[PDB]
Amino acid sequence: MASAVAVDLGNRKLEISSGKLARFADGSAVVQSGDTAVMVTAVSKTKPSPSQFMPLVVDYRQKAAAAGRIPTNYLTSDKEILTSRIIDRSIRPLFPAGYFYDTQVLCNLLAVDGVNEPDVLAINGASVALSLSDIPWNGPVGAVRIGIIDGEYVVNPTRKEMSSSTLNLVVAGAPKSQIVMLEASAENILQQDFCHAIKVGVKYTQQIIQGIQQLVKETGVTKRTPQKLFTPSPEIVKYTHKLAMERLYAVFTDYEHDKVSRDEAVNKIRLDTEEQLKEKFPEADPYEIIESFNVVAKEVFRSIVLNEYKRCDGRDLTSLRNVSCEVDMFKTLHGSALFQRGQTQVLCTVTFDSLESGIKSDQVITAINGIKDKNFMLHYEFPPYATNEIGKVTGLNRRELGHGALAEKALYPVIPRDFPFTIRVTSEVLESNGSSSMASACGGSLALMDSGVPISSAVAGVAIGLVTKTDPEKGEIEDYRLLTDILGIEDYNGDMDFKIAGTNKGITALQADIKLPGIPIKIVMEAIQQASVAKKEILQIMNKTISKPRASRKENGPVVETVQVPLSKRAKFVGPGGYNLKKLQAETGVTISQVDEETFSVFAPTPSAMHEARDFITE
Amino acid sequence: MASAVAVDLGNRKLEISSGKLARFADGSAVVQSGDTAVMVTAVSKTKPSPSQFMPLVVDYRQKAAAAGRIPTNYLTSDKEILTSRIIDRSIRPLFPAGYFYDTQVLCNLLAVDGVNEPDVLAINGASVALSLSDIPWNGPVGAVRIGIIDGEYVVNPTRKEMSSSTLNLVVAGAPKSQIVMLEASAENILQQDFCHAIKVGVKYTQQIIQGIQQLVKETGVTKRTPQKLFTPSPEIVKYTHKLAMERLYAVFTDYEHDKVSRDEAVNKIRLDTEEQLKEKFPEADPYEIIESFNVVAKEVFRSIVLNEYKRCDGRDLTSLRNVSCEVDMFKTLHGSALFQRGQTQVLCTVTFDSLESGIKSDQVITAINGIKDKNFMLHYEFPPYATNEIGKVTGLNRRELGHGALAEKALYPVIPRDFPFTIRVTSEVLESNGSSSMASACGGSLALMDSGVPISSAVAGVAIGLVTKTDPEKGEIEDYRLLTDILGIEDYNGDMDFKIAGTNKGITALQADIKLPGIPIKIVMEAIQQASVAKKEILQIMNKTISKPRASRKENGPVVETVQVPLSKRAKFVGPGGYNLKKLQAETGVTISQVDEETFSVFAPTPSAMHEARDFITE
Amino acid sequence: MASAVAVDLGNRKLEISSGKLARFADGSAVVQSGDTAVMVTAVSKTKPSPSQFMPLVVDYRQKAAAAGRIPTNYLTSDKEILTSRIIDRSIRPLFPAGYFYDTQVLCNLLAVDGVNEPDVLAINGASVALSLSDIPWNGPVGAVRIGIIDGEYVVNPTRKEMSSSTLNLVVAGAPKSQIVMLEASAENILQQDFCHAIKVGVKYTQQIIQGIQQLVKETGVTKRTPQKLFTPSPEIVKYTHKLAMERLYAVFTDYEHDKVSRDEAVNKIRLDTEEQLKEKFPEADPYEIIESFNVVAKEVFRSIVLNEYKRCDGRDLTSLRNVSCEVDMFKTLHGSALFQRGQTQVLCTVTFDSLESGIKSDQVITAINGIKDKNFMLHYEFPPYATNEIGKVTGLNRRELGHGALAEKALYPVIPRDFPFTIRVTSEVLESNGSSSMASACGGSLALMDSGVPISSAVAGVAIGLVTKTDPEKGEIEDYRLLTDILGIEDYNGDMDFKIAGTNKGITALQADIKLPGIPIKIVMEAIQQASVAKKEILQIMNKTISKPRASRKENGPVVETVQVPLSKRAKFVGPGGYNLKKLQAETGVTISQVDEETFSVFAPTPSAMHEARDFITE
């Protein structure tokens, strides 16, 4: 059934419709602004997943690069992966607990006008497809981007407006002005401006929700009745609580635990408990018995934070873990640093590469991820040994890409323009116990100064967590504790992973992963203020190992040199089709580029490389 | 045991041998023509597959590109995938029912002379390897390509002859002149010529079969006795028929069903039936009980078509489903169209790209798929939501490649030479109920006219299906119905998916996927004539939404502009090693190419891009 | 707990430490020499693998190419794969039997100085991580590279020293001077020099082991107690021996068996035996019953070699299998050969490609594998039909890469410098019964001569195997037989696959895969001498099919031609941005490169290609 509604920006209209395209899907929708149009579908199986969790995947795909100008579908980009993840975070929290059904959300860019951004359209598209579908989902959600252009707050800024915005904030909101997801990149802006952007953004999401609710009412939606919701019965939970509460409370009030000892201790309680349940309730099911212990471990864990204002390691609500750092770890590295916060350890390196390396030989491949502004990028890895695990170490890793992008944008505003080399930061998490991406931003800041990049200011980030008590009637929050710098266990037993970074004066990045079906604006405002205190604490300790850029780049650093070649010798110098230069580059790792008729510029990664190149060229 | 036979073309000899190479394989063969030689192997496991179907995979691989001139094995091409699929279709129908054994056919191009095509050799190679092996296979098959060069029918045309042929038809034949597989691309040729090519082709396959039969007789082949053939016992089938026939007949004579309601209705009968079987035959096996219901659903379904000359949706044997179409769906698209036939929906877009984009920066990668003639290509996608399913959306999809290639060749003959841009068609199946590839050809034709490409004539395609009654003695067809424009259900319960496309005056493409062990020439001749009627019907309705190309390209279309740069400024314009031009392209999506000393040509995808480029260049 | 030791070269210090980085891993270590530093981790699960074997994977990764100069981690290279495999072979033999626990070893290049090679550091790193971990592992191992530079034996030669070394030998040693792994590439050097390198290398490994033992003692290591070691009980083995010994002895003393008949015959004994065990020991476990028969089949098999000095096919300890070969298999191939040794068959082809093809258009991709010296490479494939199996035929295959590299280096020293084309050898194993890589070297030598490459001498290789009797007290070898040219079955029931290749006068390559926890130097010296005899025997039979290079390249061979283009016509010749040349290359498979202002060089793969190019250019 064709249906359509327009939502006023008010500056620009959002056109939402459904009922013409892809009508076999459980849900489908198209969202258009200007001449950009996105279709989103939602499909969810009726048979339970072999998984003992909800398998949800979001796939946002584009058909061309560079504002829809360079066709690419005939042949995964960064943009696609990051956009998929943003949509995922905007919808995941609103599925019912126990909904273990294979569910897929796909996005099709029907048309892109190079002016109106399709990413935000797709988030809204997912919301309306789910809303109009028979899939249980506690929405609707509405989403907008907020920019700050020439001093003004602009909703859903055009691509041109974005290029001069000091803010790239995306907000997804649920009814009653609850925040479901916050994603932002900012030019080191004032907390007060950042926070006002959030409130404006939320306002607009509520308008979009109103439009969606109209659409739902016209469509006459009847949700499916899932075969089963896999939540443990109140009986098995109550009993489990009886059996394990005292041991769990003991474990969680023992401050001498570290990550590993604490986990092994709850695991011991789990094994015993889980076997005593198997007997009391022989009527199956191992997975439900497993669910029950997790529910109880979680509740005991949280009740202590709520009742005693103490955390399982003895910290205050606002205390940072101990931090230590070092720069200049290894002599040959252009810059490096080790950043340790509690049992989270990341090693960061900077490497200067040629300006040329920011571009691939193939035009269309280049267009895909584009050329990094300031010729600056950060690559993040989370290898399996960081958690004493075994894992795949090849291929596309979406989480690593997302985390890298987060730490990259945290750092991006302090990077100088017109640096003579490409700046590559590598962040590698060697030990993991919470907020590796925020440690990557910190480590990156230290290594960048070590390397002698004159960054404008140091950068640090931290994760804020959340524990709530909500009435069983409505989902309404009757009490809550914000946690500074959360342990792994506080993330998984907690309600959010609110990662925010910036300088001593402003905010550069935010990624709020919220696991409740939305939270009040007041809670996120407080989270931001609380993180601001911790950030400054991290910066003070960071500034004691290094507080300004090395006054030059290191001895071992790259060098650029200009080489004159007379026409008489060009043909021999370059070789047929430039073969000599290509061979020179492969063999010495230098990068040569012809500047004019007689002039060639040589980038060498080290003085040793240049020497070797000077000898290969000295024929 | 070394054996060899030569089959006369008669113009060119086919040399078939076995017994020297890869003698561990269940079967092996080499086939040579001129100085091109192909080895094919066949391996089939003796233990049943966990699959409840026959797992058959064909892998044809080349070692170089461009007529064997550009080595590539040191590092999946289109050619490889399409060739694999053609071989698969030529052999798959001849395995016995219930043969659930992992089976792999591999092709090795021992040598390629750039004159004689290895693809056809490989099809024959697969046939002789299977024939000489202990693997149950009801062959032999013979295969030839038929060309039409300068007015003459030529069997196995050379590569040079192919380049001037108005026909590229491949036919695989079984004994008694049965057609197993038909694949063809034609320059919009007369039905009568196309049909004569088929008869000539079949004649030649029979000669090849005679040679293969000699080889088999000399070798002394003894087929294995499979552990079991997984066909349901006549007992369980007879009973199931008793239980379900009346409900199934009711469902299949209710014309008010649509795809989904019909499937859910037979599924309800399945659940009930399948539980009543479990009781009557508690002696296992769930899969056999499943097989039995499918056999019965199939037979009931087919008996109605045969006995009453009516189809499950109420159509005549020759009736098209309702069709509707639209062009100009979205303003920013260079061209677009939506084509709907029954519950099959595909969205087609055309996008003009630079001539340069038809070539990759890497020579060897370029050689692999080569440069598309007329700089024209079509990319097809069949996303999972088209059938309300969940699926992988990344990586190589062989079916999508095959379908795209089919719709591409359907359209290729009407495309003008020397168009100023690369023409890319995208076909996306949004709703699926039969013949998405033929809808892609139709949609492509509409979108191409929308975009203002002066194609010589409109193109449409359609699928013909088949239901036969054969005696249980021999496989001989005692009666049959050809079906115009088949539903999904008529494909899977049917005997073929015969997809043919062309213009009002001729044939451009054919892909006959035949599921019986071959069918008579007469049946395919009739299928072609019947499809000709439906094609023209589709064209008449298509011509009512658009019947000629837009008289110009759209407002938003690409533009080419010439830019003069004085030697004095070249070095600054281009930058070191052309860095500026590369950056310009990545940032604006324009494509610049130097024409001479002072002249640069700029391709811009839109006027907006060109403007931006004119400003980046206006420094 | 931070710990560190330095091991003197004595020329260069090896710095080994642990306890600062990645402290969650079961084991971790860093190894440094000069300013190159490598971290290695080891993780092993405590729960048994579903596998009925030890799942061990080694992943060595670099972050840049070309001596650490070209960053690549932002995006598997040959170097990475070959290095991973070398580390794997150095540690795998030292795990306890039955240790079926998922285990992963990862290597992180913390820093690379372009002087000291990280590969050898990583091997040592793996050894110390395992040693310091709670993972059962019978080490330590020590590893060094030995070079021969300007007449002197140099341990851990620098990258500069390696470039002028006539030897690249890596040795991994265990305590009491046992050799665990030998990997070497040599410039056709004297057996006596090669053997002395091994002894020097082993000496140095013992020094490294001493350092590691200190580290272990300081750390206070307590190994885990695995849940279970999956070795069959002596009871089930003793009984199985009773049941099957006589039939197994009969099968293994029947010289009329071939590979397939022998395997089917032991399999028949297995089926019967395995069912009689199920009864005698109904107390499970199928896998243990399976293990037991394999242990017994292995022991019976080996006892015959030991007691009777006869092998299961009737051969002497030192006898080669029958060999036959052929060159010039197919007319269009630049060179080709078929090499058959017993039931091992490989087809080798040579193809001349452009010098340009040794380089990719993308600089950074080129740097990754670099440019092959002498513009020579070998690509090896082991398709599934070679063993009558079904398998994946796409994607990265680590074993194929390793084997190709082995045969490549075997041949590399005899290749002439400054050949006018890239030389590509393809080796394809068509039938497999032992030592396919050594057959690839032999086949490559024949095909190279066939193709008219003036190689300095013929090359052959062969595999030596080993059967030992060791006391049950210590692992000490009380008796042993070296086997010339081993069957598949002698490899899997044997103690090593010692693959060595070279010319009549010297050694070019070695890959010793040893499956015992190290073997005495004396045994490898004897293996080398015994292989020397067989190599020369293979060379004598090879020289009877071809004993010198064809005096010219074949008729069909590539041609280079120089084409003069006047400035007046350049713009038209090359087209915009070189489009014409690119199109010419894609369409004819020729390769054009501009030599100067008016001169273009054309490489054509065949005279036919050149003709076509001369016509495309003759416009």
From Swiss-Prot, chains A, B, C:
It comes from the Eukaryota. It is found in: Cytoplasm; Mitochondrion matrix; Mitochondrion intermembrane space. Residues 558-617 form the KH domain. Transmembrane segments: none annotated. Keywords: Acetylation, Cytoplasm, Deafness, Disease variant, Exonuclease, Hydrolase, Membrane, Mitochondrion, mRNA processing, Neurodegeneration, Non-syndromic deafness, Nuclease, Nucleotidyltransferase, Phosphoprotein, Primary mitochondrial disease, RNA-binding, Spinocerebellar ataxia, Transferase, Transit peptide, Transport. The keyword Transit peptide applies. Induction: Up-regulated in cells upon senescence and terminal differentiation. Up-regulated after treatment with IFNB1/IFN-beta. One of its GO terms (biological process) is nuclear polyadenylation-dependent mRNA catabolic process. The modification N6-acetyllysine is found at residues 203, 217, 238, 242. One of its GO terms (cellular component) is mitochondrion. Changing residue 428 to G: In DFNB70; results in a hypofunctional protein leading to disturbed enzyme trimerization and impaired mitochondrial RNA import. The keyword Transit peptide applies. The modification N6-succinyllysine is found at residue 505. Changing residue 340 to R: In COXPD13; the mutation alters multimerization of the protein. Its EC number is 2.7.7.8. Belongs to the polyribonucleotide nucleotidyltransferase family. RNA-binding protein implicated in numerous RNA metabolic processes. Catalyzes the phosphorolysis of single-stranded polyribonucleotides processively in the 3'-to-5' direction. Mitochondrial intermembrane factor with RNA-processing exoribonulease activity. Component of the mitochondrial degradosome (mtEXO) complex, that degrades 3' overhang double-stranded RNA with a 3'-to-5' directionality in an ATP-dependent manner. Involved in the degradation of non-coding mitochondrial transcripts (MT-ncRNA) and tRNA-like molecules. It is linked to Combined oxidative phosphorylation deficiency 13: A mitochondrial disorder characterized by early onset severe encephalomyopathy, dystonia, choreoathetosis, bucofacial dyskinesias and combined mitochondrial respiratory chain deficiency. Nerve conductions velocities are decreased. Levels of plasma and cerebrospinal fluid lactate are increased. This is Polyribonucleotide nucleotidyltransferase 1, mitochondrial. It comes from Homo sapiens (Human). The lineage of its organism: Eukaryota, Metazoa, Chordata, Craniata, Vertebrata.
